[PDB]
Design a protein around this nucleic acid. Structure first.
Ligand SMILES: [Cl-]
Ligand SMILES: [Mg+2]
Ligand SMILES: [Mg+2]
Length: 133
RNA sequence: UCGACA
DNA sequence: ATGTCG
């Protein structure tokens, strides 16, 4: 019910779906952009949302930060919890990059630890997540 | 058959 | 429209 302002908010941005995908993480309190992924030619909204959360985990772990991560993606939050991105996007030469990043994200998750709470951003009550495009 | 999150 | 889960 209470927004945890001392947190990291991440979100995907795209042009088409499947389409060009990117993501960024921002300080929930100030909106300051902390990281941003170079656009990936072809990917899905959910893969991007997943990549954004995993990058956030890696970003916070490297800085010894225990702050939670906000995401508005029910799908991505579940994929991270399961440490498995159940995407339906076809695996071919054109989607090789997005799949490589997804596979590497999964790989990282299955070989590292973290206590970072991954929280659902309550869009219907709080408005658009701060990392929204 | 939807409902929900994007 | 398309991507996903309950
Ligand atoms: Cl990535
Ligand atoms: Mg989103
Ligand atoms: Mg958004």
């Amino acid at each position: 019910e209470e927004i945890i302002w001392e947190s990291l908010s991440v979100d995907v941005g795209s042009q088409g779906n499947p389409g060009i995908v990117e993501y960024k993480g921002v300080d929930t309190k100030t909106g300051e952009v902390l990281f941003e992924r170079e656009p990936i030619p072809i990917g899905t909204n959910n893969m991007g949302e997943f990549l954004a959360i995993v990058h956030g985990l890696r970003y916070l772990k490297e800085r010894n930060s225990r702050k939670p991560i906000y995401s508005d993606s029910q799908t991505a939050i579940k994929w991270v919890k399961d440490k498995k991105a159940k995407s339906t996007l076809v695996r071919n030469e054109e989607t090789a990059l997005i799949w490589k990043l997804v596979d590497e994200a999964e790989e990282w998750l299955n070989t590292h630890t973290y206590e970072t709470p991954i929280l659902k951003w309550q869009t219907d009550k709080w408005g658009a997540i701060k990392a929204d495009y």
